[PDB]
């Protein structure tokens, strides 16, 4: 029970425990096992040793754990240094997707700062 450079849990089922990978959800893991040919409600423990081999050849084509953490950090830092409207909001901690910042901007700004 070790898929894609991380450890994936033992006693969770097939499609659920693959979602520990940074890069798959409930849908894309159904694409893994329907292509490979495994039923979806067995655990990742008591999968045979001819089953963990090919399962990463399904995983390797996706842009995953280290390959996906870098291009997001490359995307956001590319928005930083052009001078676009998006990157100004990425370097000032104020949200990007149009939302109201007069009130309810408590995620990008963090919880409430008292006046000092």
């Amino acid at each position: 029970a070790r898929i894609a450079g991380i450890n994936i849990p033992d006693h969770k089922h097939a499609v659920i425990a693959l979602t520990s990978i940074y890069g798959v959800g409930k849908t894309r893991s159904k694409a893994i096992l329907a292509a490979a040919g495994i039923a979806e409600d067995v655990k990742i423990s008591e999968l045979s040793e001819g089953q963990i081999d090919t399962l990463r050849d399904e995983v390797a084509k996706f842009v995953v754990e280290g390959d996906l953490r870098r291009e997001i950090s490359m995307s956001i830092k590319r928005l930083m240094d052009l001078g676009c409207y998006r990157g100004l909001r990425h370097r000032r901690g104020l949200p990007v997707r149009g939302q109201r910042t007069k009130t309810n901007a408590r995620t990008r700004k963090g919880p409430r700062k008292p006046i000092k």
Partner: protein, 83 residues
Amino acid sequence: PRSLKKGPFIDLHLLKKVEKAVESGDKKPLRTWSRRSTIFPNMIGLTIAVHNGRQHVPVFVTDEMVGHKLGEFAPTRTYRGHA
């Protein structure tokens, strides 16, 4: 974003301005009120000073500014902080 069967959007005048800029070959700052036009790859390497409601602020287009729009580099509000 605009649809892809429609294609990109640009003003007909700024397309004629940049073409007349490259064909003549100037580095004069083109001032244009088209924040809603998408930048074309002939606009790379030019100074195009797009308006922000108050004045004209220059933009020298590098490579990574192709699929963007001109208004993103002309900030239209102004803010230093409250205290």
